[PDB]
């Protein structure tokens, strides 16, 4: 359950956010510059929606080779040659935060790590300060962002 002899709340805690987009296809391979202008008309275009992980800022979808990408920062290539994916808008929403409650601390001036409302001990060992939607909170080594009392940079 716990680690390291730590035994004794309200915090802000945070990947289902969609990023609308499309795909360009021609049997030729690449027009990044005119694909956008083809979209600004509001080669062929079809809607393809992806999700971005708020920490890696990485778009995820089956159309992507390994299911990941990043946005150069202009185009993104898929499984095939002729297909490049491009966003309708070249960012994490700031309306995906919440207020959880797990009480955590071992000594008076020492905090080891918290426990979710499910019961799981996340340790505060080896975490780093991370800015996320403009508010400064720690990124844990397990990979979840929390806004705690806080001394390293991710």
């Amino acid at each position, epitope marked *: 359950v716990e680690d390291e002899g730590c035994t004794n709340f309200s915090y802000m805690e945070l990947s289902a956010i969609k990023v609308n987009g499309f795909t360009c296809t021609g049997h030729f391979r690449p027009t990044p510059d005119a694909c956008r202008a083809a979209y600004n008309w509001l080669i062929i275009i079809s809607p393809s929606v992806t999700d971005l992980d708020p920490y890696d800022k990485s778009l995820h979808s089956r159309v992507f080779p390994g299911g990941k990408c990043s946005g150069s920062s202009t185009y993104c290539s898929t499984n095939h040659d002729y297909t490049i994916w491009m966003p309708e808008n070249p960012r994490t*929403p700031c309306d995906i935060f919440t207020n959880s409650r797990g009480k955590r601390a071992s000594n008076g001036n020492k905090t080891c790590g918290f426990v979710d409302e499910r019961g799981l001990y996340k340790s505060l060992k080896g975490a780093c300060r991370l800015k996320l939607c403009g508010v400064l909170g720690l990124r844990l080594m397990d990979g979840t962002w929390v806004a705690m009392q806080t001394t390293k940079w991710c």
Partner: antibody
Framework: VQLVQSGAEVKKPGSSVKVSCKAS????????VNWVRQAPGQGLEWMGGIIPIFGTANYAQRFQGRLTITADESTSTAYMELSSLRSDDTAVYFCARENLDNSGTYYYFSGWFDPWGQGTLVTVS | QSALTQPRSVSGSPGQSVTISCTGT?????????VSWYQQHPGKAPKLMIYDATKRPSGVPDRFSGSKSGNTASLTISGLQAEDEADYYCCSYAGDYTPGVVFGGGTKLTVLG
């Protein structure tokens, strides 16, 4: 939104102040309360802010451990408590709101200070 | 800390146009930027003029206009009126590693005549 602060205060090298700010009308869910200060004849400086919905407070690197912003939704009152006052802490301390949008487009401490308080002059020595 | 670089003062006669520059605006790795300008009359609180780059709140005339270019930002007052004599501060989002916002030095606009 309408903002009014507590009155002026004269203090002492080594004492502590507490300034207040009560908010009247807020149709906004995503919002934030900040405190910027203004040394006499000098510019503005962001000191720290709070997200009252979650109680999360952010602070500048300076003013570390000397300052704590606490807000209360019930009375819509916010507070800055600065302790261990030096003489160069003589300034006017404004409280400013960030009435952010509920569609999550804008970050939490980007500096969209539309409602401002009248100010609180804190003198030391 | 640091601050945004502004001029110390600009001048204009009534009906003329002036532009206050601002350098060192911050931008996230992924491009989040947020510049804002405030107007402060002597002894009064700051008052918002431009909240996003080139965006105005209600009650601020179209005389006031913002612009962004890289880490630079410019505020333009057109048809300068006497009531525009005040201090002017740009304000930028500090970015990844500095908490909050960073203010500019402040620019004094004096209206002649």
């Amino acid at each position: 939104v309408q903002l009014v602060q507590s009155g002026a205060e004269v203090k002492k090298p080594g004492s502590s102040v507490k300034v207040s700010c009560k908010a009247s009308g807020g149709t906004f869910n995503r919002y934030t309360v900040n405190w910027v200060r203004q040394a006499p004849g000098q510019g503005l400086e962001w000191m720290g802010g709070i997200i009252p919905i979650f109680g999360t407070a952010n602070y500048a690197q300076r003013f570390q451990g000397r300052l704590t912003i606490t807000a209360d939704e019930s009375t819509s009152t916010a507070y800055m408590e600065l302790s261990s006052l030096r003489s160069d802490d003589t300034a006017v301390y404004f409280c400013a709101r960030e009435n952010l949008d509920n569609s999550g487009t804008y970050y939490y401490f980007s500096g969209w200070f539309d409602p401002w308080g009248q100010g609180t002059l804190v003198t030391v020595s | 800390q640091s601050a945004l670089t502004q001029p110390r003062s600009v001048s204009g006669s009534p009906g003329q146009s002036v532009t206050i520059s601002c350098t060192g605006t911050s931008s996230d790795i992924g491009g989040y930027n947020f510049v804002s300008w405030y107007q402060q009359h002597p002894g009064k609180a700051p008052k918002l003029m431009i909240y996003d780059a080139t965006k105005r709140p209600s009650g601020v005339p179209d005389r006031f206009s913002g612009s962004k270019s890289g880490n630079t930002a410019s505020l333009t007052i057109s048809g300068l009126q006497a009531e525009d004599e005040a201090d002017y501060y740009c304000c930028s989002y500090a970015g990844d590693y500095t908490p909050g916002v960073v203010f500019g030095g402040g620019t004094k606009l004096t209206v002649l005549g």
